[PDB]
Symmetry: D2
Subunit: 334 residues, 4 copies
Amino acid sequence: AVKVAINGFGRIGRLAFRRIQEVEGLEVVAVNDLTDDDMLAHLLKYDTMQGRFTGEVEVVDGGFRVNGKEVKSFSEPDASKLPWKDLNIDVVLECTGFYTDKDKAQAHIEAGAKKVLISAPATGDLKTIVFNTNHQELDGSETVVSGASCTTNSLAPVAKVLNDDFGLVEGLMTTIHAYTGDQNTQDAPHRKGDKRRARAAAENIIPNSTGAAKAIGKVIPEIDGKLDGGAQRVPVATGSLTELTVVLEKQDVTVEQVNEAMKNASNESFGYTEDEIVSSDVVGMTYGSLFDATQTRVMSVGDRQLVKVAAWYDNEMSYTAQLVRTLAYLAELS
Amino acid sequence: GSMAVKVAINGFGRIGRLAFRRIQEVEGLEVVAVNDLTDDDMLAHLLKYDTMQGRFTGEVEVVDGGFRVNGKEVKSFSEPDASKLPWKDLNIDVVLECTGFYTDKDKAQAHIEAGAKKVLISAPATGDLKTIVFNTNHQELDGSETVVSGASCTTNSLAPVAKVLNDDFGLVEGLMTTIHAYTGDQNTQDAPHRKGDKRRARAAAENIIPNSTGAAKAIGKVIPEIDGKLDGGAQRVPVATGSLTELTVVLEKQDVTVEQVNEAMKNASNESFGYTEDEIVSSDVVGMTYGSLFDATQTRVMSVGDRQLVKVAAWYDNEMSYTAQLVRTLAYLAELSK
Amino acid sequence: AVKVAINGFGRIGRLAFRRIQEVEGLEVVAVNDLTDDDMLAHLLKYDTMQGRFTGEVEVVDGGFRVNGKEVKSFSEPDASKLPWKDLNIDVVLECTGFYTDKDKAQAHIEAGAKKVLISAPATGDLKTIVFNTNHQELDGSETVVSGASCTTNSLAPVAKVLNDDFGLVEGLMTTIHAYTGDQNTQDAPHRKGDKRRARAAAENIIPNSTGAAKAIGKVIPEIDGKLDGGAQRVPVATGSLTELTVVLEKQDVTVEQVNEAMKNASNESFGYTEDEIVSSDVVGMTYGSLFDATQTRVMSVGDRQLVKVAAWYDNEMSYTAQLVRTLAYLAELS
Amino acid sequence: AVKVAINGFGRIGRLAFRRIQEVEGLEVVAVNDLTDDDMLAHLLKYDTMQGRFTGEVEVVDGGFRVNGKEVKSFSEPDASKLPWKDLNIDVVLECTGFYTDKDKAQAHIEAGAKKVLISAPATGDLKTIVFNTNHQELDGSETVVSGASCTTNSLAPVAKVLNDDFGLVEGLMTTIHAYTGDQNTQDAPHRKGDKRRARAAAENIIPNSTGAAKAIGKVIPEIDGKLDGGAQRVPVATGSLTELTVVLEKQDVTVEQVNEAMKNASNESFGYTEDEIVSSDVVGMTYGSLFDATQTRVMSVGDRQLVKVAAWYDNEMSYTAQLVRTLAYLAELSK
Ligand SMILES: NC(=O)c1ccc[n+]([C@@H]2O[C@H](COP(=O)([O-])OP(=O)(O)OC[C@H]3O[C@@H](n4cnc5c(N)ncnc54)[C@H](O)[C@@H]3O)[C@@H](O)[C@H]2O)c1
Ligand SMILES: NC(=O)c1ccc[n+]([C@@H]2O[C@H](COP(=O)([O-])OP(=O)(O)OC[C@H]3O[C@@H](n4cnc5c(N)ncnc54)[C@H](O)[C@@H]3O)[C@@H](O)[C@H]2O)c1
Ligand SMILES: NC(=O)c1ccc[n+]([C@@H]2O[C@H](COP(=O)([O-])OP(=O)(O)OC[C@H]3O[C@@H](n4cnc5c(N)ncnc54)[C@H](O)[C@@H]3O)[C@@H](O)[C@H]2O)c1
Ligand SMILES: NC(=O)c1ccc[n+]([C@@H]2O[C@H](COP(=O)([O-])OP(=O)(O)OC[C@H]3O[C@@H](n4cnc5c(N)ncnc54)[C@H](O)[C@@H]3O)[C@@H](O)[C@H]2O)c1
C-alpha cells in the first residue's frame, strides 16, 4: 500500500483517515498534530456531525491502534523536523491550514516525504485539482498539489456544464456555508483581523470572502475571470449550498434544458437530485457536488436572461471524498 | 375632535406583539383590544418576555377582561371568527391583522363587518387591494381604502434598493436570494407540514432550508415600473431573527462602479432605508427600525468586457424592521381619514 | 410475521418503522397520520438527526412501497374508524400522543386490532414496561400496554441497581433533555397553556415537568414514591442526559462501588461507558440507557452521604429500540 | 476618579467597560489585548448577545475614543511589560484567563499597578469575593483579589440562606451553563487537553468540572466541604442556571419556607422571581443570582427530606455586574 501521513488531525484530517480505511491501496502510517494520543484517539472515535467511528481504536505506545494496525503519532509544529524519511512516507495529506503554499509545504519533502497534497487552495507553482473536473491534468511527477476548496469542488462541475453546453459569459456566486473552525465560538478578537469571523459562529449570518469563483480559472482555465462571489456563514455545523447566477451565450434557455444538462454530467463526484432536501440531508455524503434541480430558475425579460442554479455539498465529507479520490489518483500515476 | 387612533390587534403573535410594543412608543396610536386563541396569562407572559427582542419595558398585569399595560387597560378576546369581535362597541379605527389566516381582501372584510373602519394585513394578501411599503409607495393611498396589505418582510427590505437601482441605473432584470431567519411557519422537529411543504416540514433550527417567496416575483405591486423584472427565493437558516436580501442585477447604464451604487443608495437613505459601511452580522440588526439597511461592504460589480453584473445586499430584522414599517403605514392610513 | 400498524408517523413512529426493518417476524403493513403520502415517504427517507433511510421508498396507490413491500396509509383522526379488522392487525404502535389513556387507546381494539402498545406513559388500568427492567411482568394477555417514556427507560435500570445493591431511601432527578415537537419554534401561545414550552425551543434553557421519577413505581414497585424531579429542555435536537441524586441505606458508599454495580448489570438495554462522551455521541444508539461512570459523585459529611449518577439516552432512538424490543416480546407471548 | 486598566478586552473585559460607564468615580484609561484598535472598537460597538453599544466609538492615534474619553490601547502579551506606572493605574481588571494565580498576577503590580482584581477563581494566597455575600472581608490593603466565578456568584447567596435559615448538612450542584470561549467551535484538539471542551460547543450537551460548589468555603467558610457538583455546557450563547439539591437540619421543610427565606434576602445582587422564565430572559441582567421560586421542590419520604432550588444567572452580565461592584468597593476602601 501507498504510505500516507496526515499532517493536522483536524476535521478534514480525521475524516480523510476514516475515508482511507475504505480505500484499498492507501494506508495511513502516521499522524501529526499538536496534542496527546488520548485526544487524537478520542476525536477519531467520536464525531459530533459525522457519527461514531466503525472500528476499534486503542491508545498504544507511540500512537494509536486502529483495527489491529498501529498508527504512529507525533506532536511537531515544524514539518521539516518530521521523521518522514525513516517512515518511508509516500504522500503527506497536509490538513493543518498552516502550509497552504508550495514553498511552505516543501518542508515535508525536505523531511523525506515523496509528495504533498494540500487540503486547501494554495499559492505558488502548483496544480489545483477538483476530482472529475481536472484531475487528468496530473501526470504523477508532481511533488506538491492542491485539492482546492470545499466550495470550488461544489462549483467546478456546475460551471463546466454551463460553459460547455451554453457558453458562460459571466456569473456571480453566493455560498450559504456551514460555520467552520476559522470562526470564533463567542465574539472575540480574530487572529487574521477579520471583524466578521470574529463573531459568534453559531448565532449569526456572517458574510465572508471566498476564492472559489474568483479563482475558478485554476481548475477551469477557459472561464478564468468570468466568475466572482462570496459566502454567508450560517449556524449549521456542516452542510453547505452554492448558488450561482449566470449570463449565457445561448438564448431562450429553459429550466428543463439546464437540469437535463446537469443530470447528463452526473458521476461519483457530481450528483443530481430532484428531491426537496435540506442541508442535514447531505451530511456525510460523498458527492463533491450535488446539483439540486428544484432550485433552478430562469429569468427572461425580452431577449435577456439570467440563469440561477444551486448545488449542495458537505464541506467536510464532500471535500474529503474528493481529496481522497485525488490522493489515490496521484498515488496510482506515480 | 382629535383622538388617538384606536387599534385592535388580531393575532398576538410575533408581529402582533412587536406591533403592540412599537405602538407603545408611537404617540397618536393606542391598542385598545387584542384577540388570539389563548388565555390572558399567556398573552401577558409573551408580551413581558421575548427571546430575541428582550424584556418588555413596561408593567404588565392580568386584570378582568384582559391585561393592564402601565395602568392602561387592554381588552382581550379569544375568538377565531373575526366577524364576532366587538369592534363597533370599542370604536376600532384600524385592525392590524396579524394571524396569517385573513391574508385576503374578502376574508379580512370580516373585521369591517365587525365594526372596524379599516384593516391593515401584516402580510401579502390576495384580492383587489393595495400593497404598501412605507417610503416607497405609501403615497398611493388616497384614504378611500378599507383593506390594505403591509407587504412582506422581504419586500420591505427589497423595494427601496430596487427603486434606486432602477431610477439611477435602469433595471433590465434581476434575481434575489434572501438568507432568512427561521419563522413560526416551520416545524420544530421533522414532522408533517400543514401546507404540505416538504421543506418547511423540517427541523427549523438545524437546517439550511430552501423556500419560495413573493418579494421579487410580486415587486410590481409596489414598484409598477419594474413589474416582471425580478424573481428569486429564500434560504431559511438557524438564526431566530435577522435576515439578509441579496440582489443580482443587469443594468441599462454601462461602466457602473461599486462607488456609484453605494453613493446612490446613501443618497436615498431615510428612516425606512438605512445605510452602513460597518462589517456587521445578523445579530446586529435585531430590534432595528429601518425597513431595510443597505450594506455597502457587500456591493460587487462583475465586468467582462462591456457586460456587467451588479450585486447588492440589505439587512432586515424580519420581525422589527417589518413591524416598524407596518406601524408607519398604519399611522399614515389613519391620518388620511381624519 | 406479526402484522404491525403505526398510528402517528412522527418521530417515534418513523424510527419504529426503521427499526422494524431490522427485525425478522415483525412487519409494518399500515400507517395512519393526518397528511399526504408524498409527505410520509419524504419524512421516512430524510431525517435531520437520524440520517437517510438505508433502503428505498416509492410512493404508490395504497400508500408507499419500501424495499418491495407495500405499506397502506390512512388519514383517520378518529382511530376507531381505521380498518384494523380487515387488515388483521396484531399490534398497533400508538405514537400520536393523543391516545395516552387505556380507554382512549381502546379505539384501535374496537377498530379490530388485537393489541395496542402506546409509545408514551398512559393513564388507566394498564402495565408500563421498560424492556430488560420489568418486561417479564407481561404474560401475553394484555390488550393495551405502555412502553413508558424516554426518561423512564433511561432512569429505571439505574434506579433498580441503586435500590438492589444499596437500598434507596429517596432521590431527585433532573434530565437535561433535547427539545421536542411539543415545543414552539418561536415564542407563541402554547396549546396546553405551558408558558415555558411556549418559548423558542432552540434558543433557550427551558424548565419543564416530567413524570419519569414521580411514576417510577409503575416500573419498579418497591421504590414507589421515592423519586421526583423535572427536566431542563435545551437546544440539541436529540440526545438527553438523566442525572439522579439519591440517599442510600448502605453507609460508606464509594464511586467505585456504584460504577462496578452498574457495569455488572449491563446488557443490550443498559450500557456502560467510561468514555468522556457528549450528547451527539448517543444519537442513534440502541441502548435504552447508557451509564456514564465519569459522572458518578459521592458527597460525604460525617455518616451522611449523597450519591449522584448520570445516564445518557437518545430520547428518540434509545426509546424506539426499547419500544420495539417490548413489541417483539409482547407479540411472542399469548 | 479611580484609574482602571482592563487586561483582556474579551467578553468580561468589554462588558466591564460598559458597566464602568454606569459607575461614578471609576474610569477605564487603558486596555490591553492581542489585536489591533479597529478590532477592539468593533467588538465594543457590536455584541451578539448583549446588543449594540449606544455611545460613539472612534479609532484614534494610540487607542480609541468612547463618548469623548480617550482609552489607550496596547498589544502586549507579557503583563510585566505594560506601562502601568506611567499611566498611574489604580486597579487592573485581569480578564485574560491567563493570570488566574496570585504570583502570576503580581506581574501587573511589578508593572506599576496598585491593585489587581481577577475576573475568575484564582490560586494562591488571596481573597475570593462575591459581592453582597463576603465583600466585607476586604479591608483595602489587599494587592491581588479574585472576583470568584459566574457560578459561585449565582450559588453563594442561595447557599448562605439555606445554611443560615435551615442548617446545611450537605448538597450537590449541577449548573446548566451557556457555552463559553474556552470551548471549541468544531470538534478539535483542546489546548487544555479537555476531551469534552474539545467538542463542538453549540451542538452538544457537554459535561464539565466547576469549582463553585467544591470551593464554596472560600466565600462561605462555615459550609466548607459541604458542597460539590459540576456543569453541563449547553447550546445557548449566554444565560445559565444553577440547580442545588441539599439535605437540611431543619425538618418538615416546605417550598413556601424556602421561597420566603430567599425573598427576604433579596438585594441588588440577589434577585427573586415567581415568573416562569427561561434562559433568554436573564440575558443582560445585573443581579449576580436570580432565585426562581417556580423551581423549588421538597421531596419527603417519612421524616427524610431532599430540597431542590434553582437560580438563574447571565454568566456574562450577572458576573460582570458583581465584578464591577467589588471593583468599586475595593477602590473606595483606602481612599
Ligand atoms: N469544511 C471544512 O472544515 C474544510 C473544507 C475544505 C478544506 N478545509 C481546509 O482544510 C484545512 C484544515 O481545516 P479544518 O477545518 O480541518 O481545521 P481544524 O482546525 O479542525 O484542523 C487543523 C488541525 O491541525 C492542527 N495543527 C495546526 N497547526 C499545526 C502544525 N503546525 N503542525 C501540526 N498540526 C497542526 C490543529 O491542532 C488542528 O487539529 C484548512 O486549510 C481548511 O481551509 C476545511
Ligand atoms: N418574520 C416574521 O415573523 C414575519 C414578517 C413579516 C410578516 N409576517 C406575517 O405576519 C403574520 C403573523 O406571523 P407571525 O410570525 O407573527 O406568526 P405567529 O404564529 O407568531 O402569530 C400568529 C398568532 O395569531 C394567532 N391566531 C391564529 N389564528 C387566529 C384566529 N383565527 N383568530 C385569532 N388569532 C389567531 C395565533 O395563536 C398566533 O399567536 C403572518 O401572516 C406572516 O406571514 C411574519
Ligand atoms: N423524544 C421523543 O420525540 C419521544 C420519546 C419518547 C416518547 N415520545 C412520545 O411519543 C409520542 C409521539 O411523539 P413524537 O415526538 O413522535 O411526536 P410527533 O409530533 O413528531 O408525531 C406525532 C404524529 O402523530 C400525528 N397525529 C396527531 N394526531 C393524530 C391523530 N389523531 N390520528 C393520526 N395521527 C395523528 C401527527 O401528524 C404526527 O405526525 C408522544 O406521545 C411522545 O410523548 C416521544
Ligand atoms: N461566562 C463567561 O464568559 C465568564 C464568566 C465569569 C468569568 N469568566 C472568566 O473571565 C476570563 C475571561 O473570559 P472571557 O469569556 O471574557 O474570555 P475571552 O476569550 O472572551 O477574552 C479573553 C481576552 O483576553 C485576551 N488575551 C489572552 N491572552 C492575553 C494576554 N496574554 N495579554 C493580553 N490579552 C490576552 C484575548 O485576546 C481575549 O480577547 C476567564 O478567566 C474566564 O474564566 C468568564
